[PDB]
Design a protein around this ligand. Structure first.
Ligand SMILES: Nc1nc2c(c(=O)[nH]1)N[C@H]1C(S)=C(S)[C@@H](COP(=O)(O)OP(=O)(O)OC[C@H]3O[C@@H](n4cnc5c(=O)[nH]c(N)nc54)[C@H](O)[C@@H]3O)O[C@H]1N2
Ligand SMILES: Nc1nc2c(c(=O)[nH]1)N[C@H]1C(S)=C(S)[C@@H](COP(=O)(O)OP(=O)(O)OC[C@H]3O[C@@H](n4cnc5c(=O)[nH]c(N)nc54)[C@H](O)[C@@H]3O)O[C@H]1N2
Ligand code: SF4
Ligand code: SF4
Ligand code: SF4
Ligand code: SF4
Ligand code: SF4
Ligand code: SF4
Ligand code: SF4
Ligand code: SF4
Ligand code: SF4
Ligand code: SF4
Ligand code: SF4
Ligand code: SF4
Ligand code: SF4
Ligand code: SF4
Ligand SMILES: [K+]
Ligand SMILES: [K+]
Ligand SMILES: [K+]
Ligand SMILES: [K+]
Ligand SMILES: [K+]
Ligand SMILES: [K+]
Ligand SMILES: [K+]
Ligand SMILES: [K+]
Ligand SMILES: [K+]
Ligand SMILES: [K+]
Ligand SMILES: [K+]
Ligand SMILES: [Mg+2]
Ligand code: NA
Ligand SMILES: [S]
Ligand SMILES: [W+6]
Ligand SMILES: [Zn+2]
Lengths: 335, 190, 430, 80, 130, 104, 130
């Protein structure tokens, strides 16, 4: 059993079994360290790894202890640990216990509002939308009589979209004019009528005379998604649906908390916040939670130096676990 | 940046009214057997129509009995510069003196001593622990304004002020103080 | 080893009163809570000269003399002078400052403190437009917007931010997280590095920026696309942050008192703070420098009616900064003698003023060797306020705190030296 | 392992770290409110002789709050 | 090179004035010119090299150091003290307060030495008055 | 018209003009139903004069919304009708001075 | 200091090659380094002072002169000739043409002398072949 270091990533391989750790996906929750039945993993401090610059990887895996069982890969709520057996990931092998979770958008219901893309705390969503070209949202005809035009420049200055251009020049005895041409860019014009109204010699003829569909797509990146449910809750037409890995409870002691903001910064699901008072002299909850977005990972509790916030975990969503070793390991994470 | 309007309006957070502060402090004063009474500068200073707030304020500690250990004080309330608290009307346009109603209250009640706060008709300086009134004065005359909010305790403000005999408001203000001195029958209350 | 608690720091206008002094015998050997500067004042640095006796200059050499001889020669200089300047005062206590005012009346002198090289322009401004302030506890307990305009507290008032910004207050229980910190400085100072918003404006253009902010506050358009190197859109956004405060504090320093416009930079900042009160509760506090610069101006004002640059030549007090300030009297060659107390104009006045100090008698009431003692004719050493002598000092927002005597000295206090000098000047005047 | 390390030669003794620390604030109401401690208390670090001085390193949770509060990098979290 | 001279506090200049203005640490804290590395590169100098600063009001020799608090382009910083006060603008504009900050100065490299505190003060030529 | 100012070979002429304000060269009424608005941002993006402003924000557990307000600056609006047509929930209702100066 | 070396023609180098590459006028026209006055101030040199030029490919001593045709910042100019060809890049990138222009070089002041034409060519150590 050997190990390969690629920057901050770690690979533990035996010959076939290969465990890969991706440092950039790790939230430093500590669950892999807690589940390992041979204590092969050591997880660095949560606050330090998130709030400060560190050369170290977020976790350390001891080669001499790891037996490549895959329990750490299965429990990880952040897709940071992946065990591959003969090239295939354990998430594609039914014999390995798998946590039940999902996140999807119904494309027929979706109206491409982009609220879920903004709200997603892991930037896992991509919503694309095709707006029509501006010329297709307006209708009219415009032309400038260049013989009547005196090149006063008032239409060019007042045009709100800079659709008008004049070829200004210093006159000479061979070309005794202040400009040589005037043009309207019809792709930019919005048919507001400002130019025809300001023209002092009525050189501009402008007259106003069914909009195409806004198409688009949605995509949820399964590696970045943590099943927090922000997309489901924020969606105005109920097009997004999410199922979570764990169920539990958060308990905050408001008097022990000294509002250092570590847990707020650490939480990968944006559950925790510091509400601002609406009026002068009003008082607010020191540390506010909304458990609709919580996945019970335990990173907040682990990060707190005064232990003011605690996480209880009541269930890990799987079908019945057959292996006694795996059942005992999963049960130890309930509290 | 706010103020209270009348004696039943609380400040933010503390949720205690001016009437409760006045009554409680009068009781504290007599429990401590202090030589002097509570010394009160009323809410709503310098506003047309404030005479009703003043008369209500005068009644707040009336059921507290004086008990000084030293001296011969026999009144529970001392109200200061009452001229600024004797205004009628609703705005500066319909402003009138209500000094006869204030003087009638002092003549008929035995728990109060007042001081007038007589206008001398000079260019002078205002300086009080009434921070919002001083800011409001600066907002009216546009002259230099100083302020000092003191942590957990009080506030203050300073603004220059010209009381010209030829101006209508200062002329009425001078007349108010004269009415208070001259309509209060007994000088033992002034 | 004894620990003396609740000690008052005699260095900057923050006037920390939670200092712990470590005392061995009769020597302050260490501290707790004081910053690097405060600690340096309290403890003795090996090799630094601390004068044990008064000195008089003969040629280029100095001779040790008694307090009687030194005070007698100092009194003779003051009594025979037609325009004596009595300067410094900001690093001594209020009783010594009051004796100074009485001595300036007796000698027909000009009395002036470090305000003339510091927040004197803020004094000129507050006299014209006002002074809307609060005490430190109101900042700690209420402030949600904190501005440091032209001051670098991390280097100049080192515990100021920890006491007023990081502190958890009554209505700001989350400390730093409940406040928007704004710093206005042309440099990326260590104080600006902590800010939420750093306005890194063009030097000498604060007045122009403040004009744009005030016009915007009153609902008018800003004439130019960029002001003091700040784009129009960002000026409008900064004004909205100030208007949305529940309680704002504007702290300001030498960046606007010493730079182009001087007192008019402070004037426009004060008027902006006043007008902001129609939208949000706003106040300001000048970042007063020395631990007792504030006390001199309080004492001088209550006794004479004027804060600094006070001329007693005509008997009645007269006040004209620009005519009666220390730099005006030295640079215009009007002063014919100078007494320095608890200050170092030798180090801290411009070259043109030093040229005058080289030609006139200089008396220095000073404990240590400095550029001023290098330019002095008489040196009189005192016991140091806050370490070896007690008395009142005033914090930057006017809070009076009594300085403590932690250890004993055989030297006379400044107050004692000045009382003996007043008696001798009276004798020479008679 | 990762732990608290002081660089007193870079320190201003400003006290930002002492006040910002949630462990110190919980143990001392004076520190919670921005002052240096006067009452005898056991906290992580204090400003002593003008510079930061670590007293009880075992109480540190390695959260990084003190690190964000120091503009001169005089208190750090690193491999000890 | 024409630059803008800014002056003021440093925590090190504060520690030095309270330790002793007669010590070597005061020369090391206040007889210096802080500059951005780009300006040191333009002038052809390194940290520890001396610089001659000349204004309309006077002249001084100070030691170049790299600024830890970044400066805007074209600005330099000398901490408050008698070295800075050889060259800043004395005039008060009838306020009593000199112009200690943001003065145009000319800076060039020099092999001349920085003057210690008593030697610098000899430029004023104090004459004994008793 | 300023043609003489441009043509003058000695730059001896100064021609100024006070143009009418943009709002006085268009006529219409515009209103956004903020209860119907879903803050999709399409009107704000498509508006040709940036007259529409949305107060965007990152949601928090205390304020679980992508924006807190939407406004039309009626002094900037040119009544082109683009916003009403792009709105996917029909939250927008939209329907459709001489030049002075000096010569020297 | 690190600079970019450009090389090519001057009318004076043209006059010198046609007059005689064995004359003093060829050393005066081609054993030179043209630089902007600002670069001469950075190095602490004056016109007529010698400069040691070092590249990955060789070394040479040339005389500094102020450029009459201004250079972009950080560029120097040595006229074409055997002094320039001691230090430019020989490699042709499989085209037959060497890289005669825009080579990184290190330049420092020197008290060593410029070598005349026959003395410079002795660095190659020609061995007689007949
Ligand atoms: N270390 C130390 N501390 C001290 C003192 C000391 O000598 N040393 N003395 C004390 C005294 S007496 C005083 S007054 C205080 C002063 O303390 P501060 O008011 O902080 O004084 P300075 O450091 O002189 O300058 C403050 C800032 O002004 C900036 N500045 C320069 N020009 C401009 C400008 O045009 N606009 C703006 N906005 N800013 C500009 C500078 O870059 C600088 O960072 O410090 C006190 N504390
Ligand atoms: N270039 C430049 N120059 C400046 C400034 C700048 O920003 N730039 N800032 C200016 C400002 S704002 C100011 S205030 C001045 C600095 O103001 P100064 O007063 O010159 O500052 P210090 O050097 O701190 O001098 C205080 C003196 O008091 C002495 N002392 C301490 N305690 C006692 C005591 O109890 N009794 C007595 N008698 N003496 C005592 C100390 O030994 C010390 O020498 O510098 C000004 N000069
Ligand atoms: S379980 Fe938590 S700590 Fe372990 S790898 Fe996954 S995210 Fe990192
Ligand atoms: S694979 Fe099994 S043994 Fe190896 S670290 Fe993960 S849990 Fe521990
Ligand atoms: S929030 Fe709902 S409608 Fe809007 S883009 Fe996401 S899924 Fe589609
Ligand atoms: S406003 Fe009329 S005359 Fe003037 S430039 Fe435009 S089209 Fe020509
Ligand atoms: S109609 Fe309106 S948008 Fe089109 S050119 Fe005229 S002014 Fe510009
Ligand atoms: S569940 Fe949470 S993490 Fe996954 S896509 Fe929805 S918002 Fe993003
Ligand atoms: S709970 Fe702990 S981590 Fe979160 S803010 Fe409060 S003290 Fe800091
Ligand atoms: S609040 Fe919920 S999701 Fe956020 S860190 Fe704590 S346990 Fe994990
Ligand atoms: S901040 Fe000022 S008063 Fe407080 S300890 Fe430091 S120097 Fe002394
Ligand atoms: S370590 Fe940093 S924050 Fe803490 S006292 Fe020193 S300088 Fe201030
Ligand atoms: S890391 Fe967190 S717990 Fe440790 S000292 Fe810094 S602030 Fe306090
Ligand atoms: S005189 Fe008036 S109208 Fe004629 S060219 Fe000049 S600006 Fe145009
Ligand atoms: S287009 Fe309609 S829904 Fe979208 S933001 Fe504008 S008004 Fe609101
Ligand atoms: S009408 Fe045209 S200009 Fe007015 S807001 Fe809608 S899109 Fe913008
Ligand atoms: K997002
Ligand atoms: K235009
Ligand atoms: K028209
Ligand atoms: K929803
Ligand atoms: K913890
Ligand atoms: K009675
Ligand atoms: K000392
Ligand atoms: K220690
Ligand atoms: K840091
Ligand atoms: K022209
Ligand atoms: K737009
Ligand atoms: Mg108060
Ligand atoms: Na160059
Ligand atoms: S000061
Ligand atoms: W000062
Ligand atoms: Zn009163």
């Amino acid at each position: 059993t050997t190990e390969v270091i690629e920057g901050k990533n770690i690979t533990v391989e035996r010959t076939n079994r290969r465990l890969i750790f991706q440092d950039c996906l790790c939230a430093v929750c500590g669950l892999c360290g807690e589940i390992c039945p041979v204590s092969a993993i050591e997880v660095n401090p949560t606050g330090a790894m998130v709030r400060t610059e560190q050369e170290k990887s977020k976790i350390a895996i001891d080669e001499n202890k790891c037996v490549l069982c895959g329990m750490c890969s299965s429990i990880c709520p952040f897709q940071a640990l992946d065990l591959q057996i003969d090239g295939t990931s354990i998430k594609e092998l039914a014999e390995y216990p798998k946590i039940i979770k999902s996140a999807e958008i119904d494309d027929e219901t979706c109206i491409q509002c982009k609220a879920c893309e903004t709200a997603c705390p892991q930037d896992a969503i991509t919503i694309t939308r095709e707006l029509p070209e501006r010329k297709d949202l307006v209708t009219g005809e415009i032309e400038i009589d260049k013989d009547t035009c005196i090149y006063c420049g008032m239409c060019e200055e007042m045009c709100p979209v800079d659709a008008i251009e004049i070829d200004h020049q210093t006159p000479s005895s061979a070309s005794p004019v202040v400009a040589t041409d005037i043009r309207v860019d019809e792709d930019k014009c919005v048919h507001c009528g400002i130019c025809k109204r300001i023209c002092p010699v009525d050189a501009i003829m402008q007259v106003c005379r069914k909009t195409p569909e806004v198409t688009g797509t949605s995509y949820i990146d399964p590696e970045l998604c943590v099943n927090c449910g922000w997309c489901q809750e924020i969606c105005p037409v109920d097009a997004a649906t999410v199922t979570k890995p764990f169920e539990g409870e958060l308990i905050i002691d408001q008097d022990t908390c000294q509002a250092c903001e570590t847990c707020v910064m650490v939480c990968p699901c944006n559950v925790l916040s510091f509400p601002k008072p609406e009026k002068p002299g009003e008082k607010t909850t020191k540390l506010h939670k909304d458990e609709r977005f919580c996945i019970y990972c335990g990173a907040c509790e682990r990060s707190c130096p005064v232990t003011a916030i605690t996480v209880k975990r009541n269930r890990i969503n799987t079908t019945p676990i057959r292996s006694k070793a795996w059942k005992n390991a999963f049960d130890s994470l309930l509290k | 940046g706010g103020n209270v309007h009348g004696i039943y309006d609380p400040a933010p957070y503390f949720d205690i009214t001016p009437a409760e502060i006045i009554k409680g402090l009068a009781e504290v004063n007599e429990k401590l057997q202090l030589p002097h009474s509570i010394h009160l500068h009323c809410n709503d200073l310098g506003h047309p129509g404030n005479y009703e707030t003043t008369l209500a304020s005068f009644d707040v500690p009336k059921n507290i009995k004086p008990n000084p250990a030293t001296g011969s004080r026999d009144t529970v309330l001392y109200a200061t510069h009452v001229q600024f608290h004797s205004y009628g009307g609703t705005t500066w346009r319909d402003f009138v003196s209500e000094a006869p109603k204030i003087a009638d209250y002092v003549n008929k009640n035995d728990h109060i001593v007042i001081d007038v706060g007589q206008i001398t008709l000079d260019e002078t300086t205002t300086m009080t622990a009434d921070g919002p009134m001083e800011y409001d004065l600066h907002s009216l005359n546009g002259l230099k304004w100083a302020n000092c909010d003191v942590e957990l305790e009080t506030g203050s403000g300073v603004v220059p002020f010209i009381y010209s005999a030829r101006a209508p408001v200062p002329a009425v203000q001078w007349a108010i103080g004269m009415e208070l001195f001259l309509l209060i029958d007994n000088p033992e209350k002034v | 080893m004894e620990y003396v608690k609740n000690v008052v720091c005699p260095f900057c206008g923050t006037l920390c009163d939670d200092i712990i002094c470590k005392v061995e015998g009769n020597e302050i050997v260490g501290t707790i809570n004081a910053c690097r500067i405060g600690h340096s004042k309290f403890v003795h640095a090996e090799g630094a000269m601390r004068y044990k006796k008064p000195l008089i200059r003969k040629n280029g050499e100095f001779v040790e003399v008694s307090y009687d001889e030194a005070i007698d020669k100092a009194a003779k200089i003051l009594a025979e002078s037609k325009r004596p300047l009595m300067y410094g005062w900001s690093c001594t206590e209020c009783e010594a400052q009051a004796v100074g005012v009485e001595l300036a009346e007796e000698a027909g002198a000009v009395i002036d403190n470090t305000a003339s090289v510091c927040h004197g322009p803020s004094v000129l401004a507050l006299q014209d437009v006002g002074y809307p302030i609060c005490t430190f506890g109101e900042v700690k307990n209420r402030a949600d917007v904190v501005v440091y305009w032209g001051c670098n507290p991390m280097h100049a008032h080192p515990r100021h931010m920890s006491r007023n910004v990081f502190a958890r207050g009554f209505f700001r229980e989350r400390g730093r997280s409940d406040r928007t910190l704004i710093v206005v400085d042309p440099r990326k100072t260590d104080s600006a590095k902590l800010a939420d918003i750093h306005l890194q404006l063009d030097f000498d253009r604060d007045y122009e920026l403040l004009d744009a902010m005030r016009a915007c506050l009153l609902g008018h358009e800003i004439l130019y696309d960029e002001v003091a190197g700040v784009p129009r859109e960002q000026i409008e956004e900064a004004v909205e942050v100030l208007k949305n405060a529940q309680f704002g504090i504007l702290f300001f320093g030498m960046g606007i008192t010493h730079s182009r416009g001087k007192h008019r930079n402070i004037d426009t900042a004060i008027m902006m703070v006043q007008d902001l009160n129609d939208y949000a509760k706003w106040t300001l506090i000048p970042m007063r420098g020395h631990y007792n610069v504030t006390g001199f101006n309080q004492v001088c004002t209550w006794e004479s009616g004027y804060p600094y640059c006070v001329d007693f030549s005509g008997g009645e007090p007269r006040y004209n900064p620009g005519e009666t300030g220390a730099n005006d009297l030295l640079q215009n060659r009007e002063a014919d003698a100078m007494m320095v107390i608890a200050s170092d104009p030798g180090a801290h006045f411009p070259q043109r003023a030093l040229e005058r100090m080289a030609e006139i008698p200089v008396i220095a009431i000073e404990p240590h060797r400095t550029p001023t003692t290098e330019m002095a004719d008489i040196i009189i050493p005192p016991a140091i306020v806050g370490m070896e002598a007690e008395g009142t000092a005033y914090r930057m927002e006017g809070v009076p705190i009594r300085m403590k005597k932690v250890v004993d000295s055989d030297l006379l206090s400044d107050r004692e030296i000045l009382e003996r000098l007043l008696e001798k000047v009276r004798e020479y005047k008679a | 392992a990762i732990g608290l390390k002081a660089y007193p030669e870079l320190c201003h003794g400003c006290g930002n770290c002492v006040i910002a620390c949630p462990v110190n604030a919980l143990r001392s109401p004076e520190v919670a409110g921005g002052k240096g401690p006067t009452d005898d208390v056991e906290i992580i670090m204090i400003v002593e002789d003008g510079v930061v001085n670590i007293k009880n390193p075992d109480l540190c949770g390695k959260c990084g709050t003190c690190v964000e509060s120091c503009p001169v990098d005089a208190i750090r979290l690193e491999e000890l | 090179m024409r630059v803008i001279l800014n002056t003021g506090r440093t925590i090190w200049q504060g520690q030095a004035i309270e330790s002793g203005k007669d010590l070597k640490m005061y020369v090391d804290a206040a007889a210096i010119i802080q500059m951005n590395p780009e300006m040191m590169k333009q002038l052809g100098i390194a940290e520890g090299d001396n610089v001659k600063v000349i204004s309309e009001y006077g002249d001084v020799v100070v030691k170049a150091v790299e600024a830890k608090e970044p400066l805007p382009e074209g600005m330099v910083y000398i901490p408050m003290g008698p070295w800075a006060n050889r060259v800043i603008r004395p005039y008060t504009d009838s306020t009593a307060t000199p112009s200690f900050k943001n003065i145009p100065v000319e800076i060039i490299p020099t092999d001349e030495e920085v003057l210690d505190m008593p030697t610098l003060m000899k430029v004023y030529g104090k004459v004994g008055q008793i």
